[PDB]
C-alpha cells in the first residue's frame, strides 16, 4: 500500500506504515513538489518546513529580521501575526506597522482598505526597511492587495536594499508570479487553496532572497530557513538529507493535489476562484449584507461581512443550515468597539469545479439563516 | 470519505479534502488522543505540537529554560540536539553537558555507557539545575537509560526545585510511567514506536510541569507550549480552538494507530519490543559484530553496531539485500576519529506482531552482506 516497490523498513526513522524520506518514491515526490511550486510561483527555490503556514512565517522572520528594521502592512489578524511573532521573539531591531483604515468614520459599519500605496512607499524609504511583510489576502478582513500594489512595495523596498515577503496562505488559486512583481519570499500552505491535508509551511524564494538566507544565521534550530533550504537541495541534487522528520505521506498527498490542479488548469482555477468570490459576494450584497473589505480590495477566496447577529457572527446559524463557516475575529487595526463580522472560505478544487452548486448551496443556507 | 456526517465546508481553514478541526469527528479524535496518551504515560496533560518530535523538544526548551541553568545527559547526536537548540537560541542562562564514556580507551572499538548515575546526581545538586534533559533511548548510539537511572535523576532535580525532561521519541513500546519515575515532561512522536505518519511533537506533562508552564512565558510564538496547552484544554472542555492549523487527518491516523496498539495490548507490545531487540542483538554478536551501547544500556528499538565497512556504515550493502537501514552518525561525545557504525530501527506494530519473520528477514540480509 505505502511503498510497494521499496525496501524492507529497518531504519530508525519510520515503520512500514509511513513513507520513508530516503525511499525512491519520496525522492520523486520531493522533486515533483519543488519543480511544480517553482513553476507556479516563478520562484528560484521552494522550501517545505514541517508544521503549518505560521511556522513558515516564523522561519522567514527568524532568518531574515535578526536586528533588522521591518515594515508590516497590517490588514487584519493574520498580518498582526507578524507582530505577534516579532513581539514574542524580541529578535528584530524595529517594526513599523501600517494598519488598514475605514473609508469613513461613522457609527454604521464601513469597509476597510489597506494603507494607501503612496504612504506605504514613502514610509519604506524613510524607514530604510530591510524587510517588508504584507498579506496578499488577509483572512480576517477579506482584503486583497492588487498586483500593482505589491509591485510598488517591491520597487520601494528594493530601492533601499531590502526584500519583499508576501503571505499567500489565503490567496487560493489567485497565483502571483514572483519575478513579475518583484516578490522575494512567498509563503503558502497545503490546506487552503491547494486542497490537501495540513502538514507544512511553504516558503518560495527569489535569487536575492536565497543570497540573503545564505549570508544570515537563524536563531531557531527547528525553523532554520537556511538549514531547510540545504535539505531541499539534497533532494534537488538526486539524494536526500534529514534535519527533523518530514510529514512524508502528507506531502505525497499534496503532490497529488498539485497535479490534480495542474490537469484541470491553473488559469482555469484562477478564473474560477474570482467567479465564485464575485458570485458569493453578490448574493450577500443582494441581501443587504455589507463587505468588511472596501471596493477594489475584495478577496475572492475569503469573504468577510458585517453582521449584528451573534448566531451569524459565531457561525451557529449557518451550522443549523448544514454549513461550516468561520466565526468573525478582530483585526487589531483600531476597529470600532461594535465591530462584528462573519467569514466564509471559498477554497478548494471541489468548489472551483462546481461553481453553480457551491453558490446555490450557500444561497439556500443564507436564505434559511435570514428567514 | 473524510467527514461524511459533517457540515458542508465553507470555513477559511480547510477544503472538503481535509478534516476540519472544528468538526465533531476531530473533537472525538482529540479526546481519544489526549485520554489514551495520558493513560499510557500516566501524564496529567498531553500536548500535540504540529511539526515533529524536534519541535516538541524546542517548545519545551523555549518555555522552561529562559534564563535557567540546565543539565543535559548527552549519549549521542539526538541529545546533542538539546545543545544545538540552546546554542542557536541563546536563551538559556547556562548548560552543563555530561557526555557518555567508553568502557575502555583502546585502539579497538569499545562500547559506550552514560555518565554514571552517582556523578549525574551529584552534578545536578551542585548546578541547582532548573531543568534536566535526558534521552530514554539515544538513536545514534542505541543507549537506553534504566528506569531506576531516570528515577535517580528525578529525585536529584526535584531536591533542588527543578523538573525532569525525558526524550522518549526512540523508546518504541518501552513505556515509561511518569509518576512512578518522577518525570515531568515526556516527549514522543507518532512515527517511530506508534506506527503512524509523521506530523507532530508530543509533549506529556506532570502537575509540576503544568504549573511551571503556566507561570512562564515562551519566546517563540509558533512553538509556545503554554499556548498549545490552552488549545488542548479547549478540546478537553468539549469545544475547540485555533493557534496554527493542526495536521488533522494525520492525527486521526495516529488515533487509529494508538487504538490498534491498545487492542493488541500495550504490555504484549512492550515485551515484544524487548524480544525483538534482544534477538536481533544476538544475531549480530553471533557474527562477531559488536554493540556501540555497553552491557546493561542496550536499547531494544534501536540497535547501533560497529563496522569497518563503508557499505555497511552508509547502508548500501543492506539496500542491495533489500533492506533500508540508517547510516551511522557521530555521537558528539569525544568518540575516537576511527568511529564507524551502522544502525537498525526495530519500530512498529508489524515487526512486533511478527517477531520470527522480522528476525529471519534481517538474518538473510545480514548473511548476504557478510558473504
Coordinates of C-alpha atoms in Angstrom, one line a residue, chain A residues 62-215:
Chain A
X62 CA 13.8 34.4 12.3
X63 CA 16.2 34.0 9.3
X64 CA 15.9 37.5 7.8
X65 CA 14.9 40.0 10.6
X66 CA 17.6 39.5 13.3
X67 CA 18.5 43.1 14.3
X68 CA 16.7 44.5 11.3
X69 CA 14.1 47.2 10.9
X70 CA 11.0 45.9 9.2
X71 CA 7.7 47.2 7.9
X72 CA 4.4 45.4 8.1
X73 CA 1.2 46.1 6.2
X74 CA -1.4 45.0 8.8
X75 CA -4.8 44.4 7.2
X76 CA -6.2 42.1 10.0
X77 CA -5.4 39.3 12.4
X78 CA -3.1 37.3 10.3
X79 CA -0.8 40.2 9.4
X80 CA -1.0 41.1 13.1
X81 CA 0.6 37.7 13.3
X82 CA 3.8 39.2 12.1
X83 CA 3.7 41.5 15.1
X84 CA 2.9 38.6 17.4
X85 CA 5.9 36.7 16.1
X86 CA 8.3 39.6 16.5
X87 CA 7.0 40.6 20.0
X88 CA 7.3 37.1 21.4
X89 CA 10.8 36.7 20.0
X90 CA 12.3 40.1 20.6
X91 CA 14.9 39.5 17.9
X92 CA 14.1 42.4 15.4
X93 CA 15.7 45.8 15.7
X94 CA 12.4 47.6 15.0
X95 CA 9.0 47.3 13.5
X96 CA 6.8 49.8 11.7
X97 CA 3.1 48.8 11.4
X98 CA 0.8 50.5 8.7
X99 CA -2.7 49.5 9.6
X100 CA -5.8 49.3 7.4
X101 CA -8.2 52.4 7.6
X102 CA -12.1 52.6 7.3
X103 CA -13.3 54.5 4.2
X104 CA -15.4 56.7 6.6
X105 CA -15.6 57.2 10.5
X106 CA -19.4 56.8 11.2
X107 CA -21.4 54.8 13.8
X108 CA -22.7 52.5 11.0
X109 CA -20.3 49.8 9.7
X110 CA -17.8 50.9 6.9
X111 CA -15.5 48.8 4.9
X112 CA -11.7 48.8 5.3
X113 CA -8.9 49.4 2.8
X114 CA -5.2 48.9 3.2
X115 CA -2.9 51.9 3.8
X116 CA -2.7 53.8 0.6
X117 CA 0.3 52.8 -1.6
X118 CA 1.9 56.3 -1.8
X119 CA 2.1 56.3 2.0
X120 CA 3.4 52.8 2.2
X121 CA 6.0 53.5 -0.4
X122 CA 7.2 56.7 1.3
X123 CA 7.4 55.1 4.7
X124 CA 9.5 52.2 3.5
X125 CA 12.1 54.6 2.1
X126 CA 12.1 56.7 5.3
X127 CA 12.5 53.5 7.4
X128 CA 15.2 52.0 5.0
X129 CA 13.3 48.7 5.7
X130 CA 15.4 45.6 5.4
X131 CA 12.2 43.5 5.1
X132 CA 8.6 44.4 4.2
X133 CA 5.8 41.9 5.2
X134 CA 2.3 42.0 3.6
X135 CA -0.6 39.6 3.3
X136 CA -1.8 39.0 -0.3
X137 CA -5.2 38.0 1.2
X138 CA -5.9 38.8 4.8
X139 CA -8.3 36.2 6.2
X140 CA -9.9 38.2 8.9
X141 CA -11.0 41.1 6.7
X142 CA -11.2 39.6 3.2
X143 CA -8.8 42.3 2.0
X144 CA -6.7 41.5 -1.1
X145 CA -3.7 43.6 -2.2
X146 CA -3.5 44.2 -6.0
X147 CA -0.6 43.0 -8.2
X148 CA 0.3 46.6 -8.9
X149 CA 0.3 47.4 -5.1
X150 CA 2.6 44.5 -4.3
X151 CA 4.9 45.6 -7.2
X152 CA 5.0 49.1 -5.7
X153 CA 6.1 47.7 -2.4
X154 CA 8.7 45.6 -4.2
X155 CA 10.3 48.5 -6.0
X156 CA 10.2 50.7 -2.8
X157 CA 11.9 48.1 -0.6
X158 CA 14.4 47.2 -3.4
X159 CA 15.4 50.9 -3.7
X160 CA 16.7 50.8 -0.1
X161 CA 18.3 47.3 -0.3
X162 CA 15.6 45.1 1.3
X163 CA 13.4 42.2 0.4
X164 CA 9.6 41.8 0.0
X165 CA 7.8 39.0 1.9
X166 CA 4.2 38.2 0.7
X167 CA 1.9 35.9 2.7
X168 CA -0.2 33.9 0.2
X169 CA -1.6 31.4 2.6
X170 CA -5.2 32.7 1.8
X171 CA -4.6 33.5 -1.9
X172 CA -6.4 30.4 -3.0
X173 CA -5.8 30.0 -6.8
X174 CA -5.0 33.7 -7.3
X175 CA -1.4 32.9 -8.3
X176 CA 1.3 35.5 -8.0
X177 CA 4.4 35.4 -10.4
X178 CA 7.2 36.5 -8.2
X179 CA 9.6 37.9 -10.8
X180 CA 7.0 39.9 -12.5
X181 CA 6.0 41.5 -9.1
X182 CA 9.5 41.5 -7.5
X183 CA 8.5 39.3 -4.6
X184 CA 11.4 37.8 -2.7
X185 CA 9.7 35.4 -0.2
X186 CA 6.2 34.0 -0.9
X187 CA 4.6 31.9 1.8
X188 CA 1.9 29.2 1.2
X189 CA 0.4 26.1 2.9
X190 CA -1.2 23.0 1.5
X191 CA -4.6 23.2 3.2
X192 CA -6.4 26.3 1.9
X193 CA -6.1 26.8 -1.9
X194 CA -4.1 23.7 -2.6
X195 CA -6.8 21.2 -1.3
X196 CA -4.7 18.8 0.7
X197 CA -4.1 17.9 4.4
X198 CA -2.3 20.3 6.6
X199 CA 1.3 19.5 7.3
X200 CA 3.8 22.2 6.4
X201 CA 4.7 25.8 5.7
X202 CA 5.8 26.5 2.1
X203 CA 8.5 29.2 1.6
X204 CA 9.3 30.2 -2.0
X205 CA 12.4 32.4 -2.6
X206 CA 13.9 34.7 -5.2
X207 CA 17.6 34.8 -6.1
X208 CA 18.1 37.8 -3.8
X209 CA 16.3 36.0 -1.0
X210 CA 18.4 32.9 -1.5
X211 CA 21.5 35.1 -1.3
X212 CA 20.4 36.7 1.9
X213 CA 19.3 33.4 3.6
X214 CA 22.8 32.1 2.8
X215 CA 24.5 35.1 4.4

